[PDB]
Protein backbone atom coordinates (compact mmCIF):
# COMPACT_ATOMS: atom_id res chain seq x y z
CA UNK A 1 0.00 0.00 0.00
CA UNK A 2 2.27 3.10 1.46
CA UNK A 3 4.91 0.70 2.14
CA UNK A 4 6.29 1.85 -1.24
CA UNK A 5 5.09 5.23 -1.62
CA UNK A 6 8.68 6.02 0.62
CA UNK A 7 11.12 4.21 -2.04
CA UNK A 8 9.84 6.49 -4.75
CA UNK A 9 9.74 9.43 -2.39
CA UNK A 10 12.71 8.42 -1.31
CA UNK A 11 14.55 8.55 -4.74
CA UNK A 12 13.12 11.63 -5.79
CA UNK A 13 15.06 13.04 -2.75
CA UNK A 14 18.57 11.53 -4.26
CA UNK A 15 17.70 12.78 -7.81
CA UNK A 16 17.00 16.11 -6.66
CA UNK A 17 20.04 15.85 -4.89
CA UNK A 18 22.24 15.50 -7.54
CA UNK A 19 20.69 18.42 -9.52
CA UNK A 20 21.53 20.07 -6.75
CA UNK A 21 24.76 19.57 -6.34
CA UNK A 22 25.75 19.71 -10.36
CA UNK A 23 23.47 22.04 -10.99
CA UNK A 24 26.02 24.70 -10.75
CA UNK A 25 23.57 27.48 -10.02
CA UNK A 26 22.50 25.68 -6.75
CA UNK A 27 26.03 23.43 -6.66
CA UNK A 28 27.27 26.90 -4.66
CA UNK A 29 24.68 27.39 -2.18
CA UNK A 30 24.00 23.65 -1.56
CA UNK A 31 27.91 22.18 -0.92
CA UNK A 32 27.92 26.00 0.68
CA UNK A 33 25.38 25.67 3.51
CA UNK A 34 25.31 21.95 3.83
CA UNK A 35 29.05 22.95 5.39
CA UNK A 36 28.95 25.70 7.11
CA UNK A 37 29.79 26.41 10.76
CA UNK A 38 26.72 26.03 13.05
CA UNK A 39 27.04 27.15 17.04
CA UNK A 40 24.62 26.15 19.25
CA UNK A 41 24.37 27.30 23.08
CA UNK A 42 21.60 26.73 25.71
CA UNK A 43 22.79 28.91 28.49
CA UNK A 44 25.98 27.89 29.21
CA UNK A 45 27.12 24.62 27.37
CA UNK A 46 28.04 26.12 23.61
CA UNK A 47 28.24 23.17 21.24
CA UNK A 48 29.48 24.12 17.73
CA UNK A 49 29.59 21.56 14.79
CA UNK A 50 28.68 21.67 10.95
CA UNK A 51 25.40 22.08 9.29
CA UNK A 52 25.12 18.84 7.97
CA UNK A 53 26.57 16.81 11.04
CA UNK A 54 23.97 18.03 13.10
CA UNK A 55 21.50 17.27 10.55
CA UNK A 56 22.84 13.70 10.68
CA UNK A 57 23.09 13.61 14.23
CA UNK A 58 19.45 14.55 14.74
CA UNK A 59 18.23 12.54 11.53
CA UNK A 60 19.74 8.89 12.35
CA UNK A 61 18.97 9.44 15.60
CA UNK A 62 15.15 10.07 15.29
CA UNK A 63 15.54 7.09 12.53
CA UNK A 64 17.23 4.82 15.07
CA UNK A 65 14.88 5.45 17.72
CA UNK A 66 12.31 4.03 15.63
CA UNK A 67 14.65 0.90 14.90
CA UNK A 68 15.18 0.58 18.79
CA UNK A 69 11.68 0.23 19.10
CA UNK A 70 11.04 -2.27 16.19
CA UNK A 71 14.46 -4.49 17.49
CA UNK A 72 12.82 -4.59 21.12
CA UNK A 73 9.33 -5.68 19.67
CA UNK A 74 10.50 -8.81 17.44
CA UNK A 75 12.92 -9.82 20.14
CA UNK A 76 10.63 -9.29 22.94
CA UNK A 77 7.19 -10.60 20.60
CA UNK A 78 6.97 -11.18 17.06
CA UNK A 79 9.73 -12.50 14.92
CA UNK A 80 12.42 -12.75 16.90
CA UNK A 81 11.43 -13.38 20.83
CA UNK A 82 12.12 -17.59 20.95
CA UNK A 83 15.82 -18.78 19.54
CA UNK A 84 13.98 -20.55 16.81
CA UNK A 85 12.49 -18.08 14.69
CA UNK A 86 15.94 -16.03 15.43
CA UNK A 87 18.32 -18.49 14.59
CA UNK A 88 17.59 -18.31 10.98
CA UNK A 89 17.72 -14.30 10.35
CA UNK A 90 20.33 -13.77 12.66
CA UNK A 91 22.34 -16.51 11.24
CA UNK A 92 21.10 -15.16 8.00
CA UNK A 93 22.55 -11.77 8.94
CA UNK A 94 25.90 -12.53 10.88
CA UNK A 95 26.39 -13.53 7.28
CA UNK A 96 25.05 -10.71 5.92
CA UNK A 97 27.91 -8.20 7.54
CA UNK A 98 30.79 -10.74 7.49
CA UNK A 99 31.20 -11.46 4.11
CA UNK A 100 30.60 -7.90 2.60
CA UNK A 101 33.62 -6.93 4.74
CA UNK A 102 35.61 -9.90 4.24
CA UNK A 103 35.41 -9.60 1.23
CA UNK A 104 36.03 -5.82 0.55
CA UNK A 105 38.15 -5.52 3.83
CA UNK A 106 40.57 -8.72 2.14
CA UNK A 107 40.32 -6.15 -1.43
CA UNK A 108 41.43 -3.28 0.79
CA UNK A 109 43.72 -4.68 3.60
CA UNK A 110 46.30 -1.42 2.71
CA UNK A 111 45.37 1.85 4.99
CA UNK A 112 43.30 4.91 5.33
CA UNK A 113 40.79 2.34 3.46
CA UNK A 114 40.82 -0.57 6.62
CA UNK A 115 38.17 1.33 8.64
CA UNK A 116 36.22 1.61 5.65
CA UNK A 117 35.65 -1.77 4.83
CA UNK A 118 34.92 -2.84 7.96
CA UNK A 119 31.26 -1.79 7.64
CA UNK A 120 30.16 0.45 4.58
CA UNK A 121 29.41 -2.26 2.13
CA UNK A 122 27.23 -4.14 5.81
CA UNK A 123 24.16 -1.61 5.75
CA UNK A 124 21.08 -2.09 3.73
CA UNK A 125 18.80 0.38 2.98
CA UNK A 126 15.69 -1.53 5.16
CA UNK A 127 13.77 1.31 3.82
CA UNK A 128 14.69 0.79 -0.19
CA UNK A 129 14.78 -3.00 0.45
CA UNK A 130 11.04 -3.08 1.08
CA UNK A 131 10.10 -0.79 -1.04
CA UNK A 132 10.92 -2.40 -4.62
CA UNK A 133 9.82 -5.51 -2.66
CA UNK A 134 6.48 -4.02 -2.81
CA UNK A 135 6.08 -3.29 -6.21
CA UNK A 136 5.64 -7.05 -6.34
CA UNK A 137 1.52 -7.30 -6.05
CA UNK A 138 1.29 -9.10 -2.64
CA UNK A 139 2.09 -12.77 -3.36
CA UNK A 140 4.96 -14.49 -1.83
CA UNK A 141 5.74 -11.69 0.88
CA UNK A 142 4.08 -11.67 4.14
CA UNK A 143 6.53 -13.75 5.59
CA UNK A 144 9.38 -12.95 3.20
CA UNK A 145 9.17 -9.21 3.98
CA UNK A 146 8.86 -9.97 7.83
CA UNK A 147 11.95 -11.85 7.42
CA UNK A 148 14.22 -9.54 5.45
CA UNK A 149 13.68 -6.66 7.84
CA UNK A 150 15.59 -9.05 10.46
CA UNK A 151 18.52 -8.93 8.59
CA UNK A 152 18.61 -4.76 8.07
CA UNK A 153 18.00 -4.18 11.05
CA UNK A 154 20.38 -6.58 12.58
CA UNK A 155 23.41 -5.96 9.79
CA UNK A 156 22.70 -2.44 10.61
CA UNK A 157 22.19 -2.04 14.42
CA UNK A 158 24.79 -4.21 14.46
CA UNK A 159 27.40 -2.27 12.49
CA UNK A 160 26.70 0.98 14.37
CA UNK A 161 27.29 -0.63 17.47
CA UNK A 162 30.35 -2.50 16.47
CA UNK A 163 32.05 0.92 15.29
CA UNK A 164 30.73 2.45 18.60
CA UNK A 165 33.56 -0.21 20.40
CA UNK A 166 35.94 0.03 17.56
CA UNK A 167 36.19 3.73 18.27
CA UNK A 168 38.31 4.82 21.45
CA UNK A 169 34.99 6.56 22.74
CA UNK A 170 35.92 10.08 23.55
CA UNK A 171 35.03 9.69 26.63
CA UNK A 172 34.73 13.32 27.58
CA UNK A 173 34.39 12.89 31.15
CA UNK A 174 31.54 14.73 32.40
CA UNK A 175 29.58 13.68 29.10
CA UNK A 176 29.79 9.61 29.54
CA UNK A 177 28.85 10.73 33.33
CA UNK A 178 25.52 12.65 32.44
CA UNK A 179 24.90 9.99 29.66
CA UNK A 180 24.83 7.77 32.58
CA UNK A 181 22.68 9.04 34.88
CA UNK A 182 20.33 10.25 32.14
CA UNK A 183 20.38 6.42 31.05
CA UNK A 184 20.03 5.45 34.45
CA UNK A 185 16.57 7.67 34.82
CA UNK A 186 15.48 6.00 31.64
CA UNK A 187 15.78 2.94 33.75
CA UNK A 188 14.50 3.48 37.05
CA UNK A 189 12.11 5.69 34.83
CA UNK A 190 10.61 2.45 33.45
CA UNK A 191 10.37 0.65 36.39
CA UNK A 192 8.24 2.15 38.54
CA UNK A 193 6.23 2.14 35.34
CA UNK A 194 5.91 5.75 33.61
CA UNK A 195 3.89 5.15 30.13
CA UNK A 196 3.54 8.84 29.68
CA UNK A 197 6.17 8.83 26.14
CA UNK A 198 6.49 12.01 26.52
CA UNK A 199 9.32 12.21 28.74
CA UNK A 200 11.61 8.81 27.50
CA UNK A 201 11.79 11.39 24.42
CA UNK A 202 13.34 14.32 26.64
CA UNK A 203 15.29 12.61 28.55
CA UNK A 204 16.62 10.78 25.52
CA UNK A 205 17.78 14.32 23.70
CA UNK A 206 19.39 15.12 26.74
CA UNK A 207 21.37 11.88 26.71
CA UNK A 208 21.83 12.48 22.89
CA UNK A 209 22.97 16.25 23.83
CA UNK A 210 25.29 14.54 26.09
CA UNK A 211 27.04 12.19 23.73
CA UNK A 212 27.26 14.69 20.82
CA UNK A 213 30.68 14.50 19.91
CA UNK A 214 30.21 11.63 18.64
CA UNK A 215 28.11 10.67 16.02
CA UNK A 216 27.67 6.84 15.87
CA UNK A 217 26.98 7.16 19.86
CA UNK A 218 24.19 10.41 19.58
CA UNK A 219 22.61 7.75 16.71
CA UNK A 220 22.83 4.94 19.40
CA UNK A 221 20.67 7.29 21.69
CA UNK A 222 18.03 6.81 19.78
CA UNK A 223 18.18 3.04 19.97
CA UNK A 224 18.94 3.13 23.74
CA UNK A 225 15.50 5.08 24.35
CA UNK A 226 13.44 3.22 21.72
CA UNK A 227 14.82 0.21 24.00
CA UNK A 228 13.38 1.78 27.19
CA UNK A 229 10.08 3.18 26.06
CA UNK A 230 7.87 0.79 27.82
CA UNK A 231 6.36 -2.08 25.96
CA UNK A 232 3.72 -4.45 27.52
CA UNK A 233 0.08 -3.81 26.53
CA UNK A 234 -0.26 -4.51 30.53
CA UNK A 235 -1.71 -0.42 30.67
CA UNK A 236 -4.34 -1.61 28.28
CA UNK A 237 -2.79 -0.04 25.36
CA UNK A 238 1.34 -0.06 24.38
CA UNK A 239 3.00 3.37 24.79
CA UNK A 240 6.13 2.20 22.11
CA UNK A 241 3.55 0.48 19.62
CA UNK A 242 1.44 4.01 19.73
CA UNK A 243 5.18 6.06 19.24
CA UNK A 244 6.30 3.07 16.56
CA UNK A 245 3.46 3.98 14.41
CA UNK A 246 2.92 7.62 14.79
CA UNK A 247 6.63 7.86 13.79
CA UNK A 248 6.83 5.32 10.61
CA UNK A 249 5.32 7.87 8.15
CA UNK A 250 7.15 10.37 9.88
CA UNK A 251 10.49 8.42 9.32
CA UNK A 252 9.92 7.05 5.78
CA UNK A 253 8.76 10.41 4.57
CA UNK A 254 10.25 13.10 6.32
CA UNK A 255 13.26 12.11 7.94
CA UNK A 256 14.55 9.19 5.72
CA UNK A 257 14.08 11.31 2.90
CA UNK A 258 15.38 14.28 4.27
CA UNK A 259 18.18 12.81 5.48
CA UNK A 260 19.17 11.38 2.08
CA UNK A 261 18.75 14.92 0.17
CA UNK A 262 22.02 16.54 2.39
CA UNK A 263 23.94 13.03 2.06
CA UNK A 264 22.83 11.77 -1.93
CA UNK A 265 23.87 14.80 -3.78
CA UNK A 266 26.68 13.05 -4.68
CA UNK A 267 29.22 15.40 -7.38
CA UNK A 268 30.21 13.62 -11.07
CA UNK A 269 30.50 16.41 -12.97
CA UNK A 270 33.84 18.20 -12.19
CA UNK A 271 35.62 15.13 -12.90
CA UNK A 272 32.88 12.74 -14.79
CA UNK A 273 35.43 10.24 -14.55
CA UNK A 274 34.70 8.34 -17.20
CA UNK A 275 33.40 4.10 -16.94
CA UNK A 276 36.36 2.16 -15.26
CA UNK A 277 37.59 5.15 -13.83
CA UNK A 278 35.03 4.41 -11.12
CA UNK A 279 35.62 0.13 -11.05
CA UNK A 280 38.82 0.46 -11.76
CA UNK A 281 39.67 2.63 -8.34
CA UNK A 282 40.46 0.72 -5.48
CA UNK A 283 37.89 -1.54 -3.28
CA UNK A 284 37.21 2.12 -1.50
CA UNK A 285 34.96 1.52 -5.20
CA UNK A 286 35.16 -1.61 -7.01
CA UNK A 287 35.46 -3.26 -3.38
CA UNK A 288 32.03 -1.89 -2.07
CA UNK A 289 30.65 -1.56 -5.42
CA UNK A 290 31.21 -5.34 -5.35
CA UNK A 291 31.01 -6.14 -1.72
CA UNK A 292 27.63 -5.46 -2.09
CA UNK A 293 26.05 -7.19 -5.02
CA UNK A 294 28.64 -10.02 -4.05
CA UNK A 295 27.31 -9.58 -0.83
CA UNK A 296 24.04 -11.98 -1.55
CA UNK A 297 27.26 -14.41 -1.96
CA UNK A 298 26.56 -15.23 1.75
CA UNK A 299 23.02 -16.16 2.45
CA UNK A 300 23.36 -18.70 -0.26
CA UNK A 301 26.36 -19.73 1.82
CA UNK A 302 25.35 -18.87 5.33
CA UNK A 303 21.41 -18.59 5.13
CA UNK A 304 21.47 -22.05 3.01
CA UNK A 305 24.91 -23.35 5.10
CA UNK A 306 21.15 -24.21 7.38
CA UNK A 307 20.50 -27.20 6.10
CA UNK A 308 21.22 -28.43 9.66
CA UNK A 309 18.10 -28.03 11.68
CA UNK A 310 16.84 -24.49 10.63
CA UNK A 311 13.25 -24.00 9.10
CA UNK A 312 12.78 -21.22 6.51
CA UNK A 313 9.61 -20.22 7.72
CA UNK A 314 6.44 -20.70 5.18
CA UNK A 315 8.74 -18.76 3.12
CA UNK A 316 8.86 -20.28 -0.63
CA UNK A 317 12.15 -21.82 -1.16
CA UNK A 318 15.47 -21.09 -3.08
CA UNK A 319 13.06 -17.53 -3.56
CA UNK A 320 14.75 -16.61 -0.62
CA UNK A 321 17.97 -15.81 -2.42
CA UNK A 322 16.25 -13.23 -4.24
CA UNK A 323 16.35 -11.10 -0.73
CA UNK A 324 19.94 -11.39 -0.42
CA UNK A 325 20.29 -9.96 -3.64
CA UNK A 326 18.10 -6.69 -2.00
CA UNK A 327 20.05 -6.66 0.83
CA UNK A 328 22.92 -5.50 -1.24
CA UNK A 329 21.33 -2.24 -1.61
CA UNK A 330 22.86 -0.11 1.60
CA UNK A 331 21.79 2.92 0.01
CA UNK A 332 21.19 5.49 2.62
CA UNK A 333 22.03 3.22 5.71
CA UNK A 334 25.78 2.81 3.76
CA UNK A 335 25.90 6.74 3.01
CA UNK A 336 24.95 7.12 6.65
CA UNK A 337 27.62 4.03 8.00
CA UNK A 338 30.11 6.08 4.81
CA UNK A 339 30.26 9.30 6.71
CA UNK A 340 30.55 7.38 10.04
CA UNK A 341 33.65 5.87 8.28
CA UNK A 342 34.83 9.09 6.96
CA UNK A 343 33.10 12.37 7.08
CA UNK A 344 35.53 14.32 9.31
CA UNK A 345 38.30 11.93 8.65
CA UNK A 346 39.56 11.89 4.88
CA UNK A 347 36.47 13.33 3.15
CA UNK A 348 37.39 13.73 -0.41
CA UNK A 349 37.47 10.03 -1.05
CA UNK A 350 33.64 10.37 0.40
CA UNK A 351 32.56 11.54 -2.83
CA UNK A 352 33.67 7.96 -3.98
CA UNK A 353 32.31 5.82 -1.52
CA UNK A 354 28.89 7.46 -2.64
CA UNK A 355 29.35 6.98 -6.15
CA UNK A 356 30.65 3.12 -5.46
CA UNK A 357 27.73 2.61 -2.79
CA UNK A 358 25.25 3.75 -5.16
CA UNK A 359 26.38 1.78 -7.98
CA UNK A 360 26.53 -1.19 -6.29
CA UNK A 361 23.37 -0.11 -4.86
CA UNK A 362 21.17 0.49 -8.02
CA UNK A 363 23.42 -2.80 -10.34
CA UNK A 364 21.52 -4.74 -7.30
CA UNK A 365 18.41 -3.55 -7.14
CA UNK A 366 16.92 -4.89 -10.61
CA UNK A 367 19.54 -6.94 -11.18
CA UNK A 368 17.62 -8.24 -8.25
CA UNK A 369 14.14 -6.99 -8.57
CA UNK A 370 13.50 -8.83 -12.13
CA UNK A 371 14.86 -12.09 -11.19
CA UNK A 372 12.03 -11.89 -8.53
CA UNK A 373 8.84 -10.72 -10.78
CA UNK A 374 9.29 -13.82 -13.15
CA UNK A 375 8.50 -16.10 -10.06
CA UNK A 376 5.46 -14.72 -10.04
Same mark, same amino acid.
Given at each position: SSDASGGIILIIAAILAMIMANSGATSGWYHDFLETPVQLRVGSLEINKNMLLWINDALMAVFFLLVGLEVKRELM?? /??? /?LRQAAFPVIAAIGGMIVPALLYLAFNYADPITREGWAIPAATDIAFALGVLALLGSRVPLALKIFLMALAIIDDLGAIIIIALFYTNDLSMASLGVAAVAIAVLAVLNLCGARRTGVYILVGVVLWTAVLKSGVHATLAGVIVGFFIPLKEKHGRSPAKRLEHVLHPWVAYLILPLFAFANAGVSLQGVTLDGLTSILPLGIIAGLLIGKPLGISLFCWLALRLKLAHLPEGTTYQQIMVVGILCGIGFTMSIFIASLAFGSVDPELINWAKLGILVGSISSAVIGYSWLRVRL
Amino acid at each position: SSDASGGIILIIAAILAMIMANSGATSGWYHDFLETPVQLRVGSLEINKNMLLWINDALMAVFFLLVGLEVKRELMQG /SLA /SLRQAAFPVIAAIGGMIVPALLYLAFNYADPITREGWAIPAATDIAFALGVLALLGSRVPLALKIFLMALAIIDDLGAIIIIALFYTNDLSMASLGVAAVAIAVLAVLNLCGARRTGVYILVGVVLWTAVLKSGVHATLAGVIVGFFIPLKEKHGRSPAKRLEHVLHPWVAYLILPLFAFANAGVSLQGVTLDGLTSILPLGIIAGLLIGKPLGISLFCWLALRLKLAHLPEGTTYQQIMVVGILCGIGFTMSIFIASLAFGSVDPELINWAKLGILVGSISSAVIGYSWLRVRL
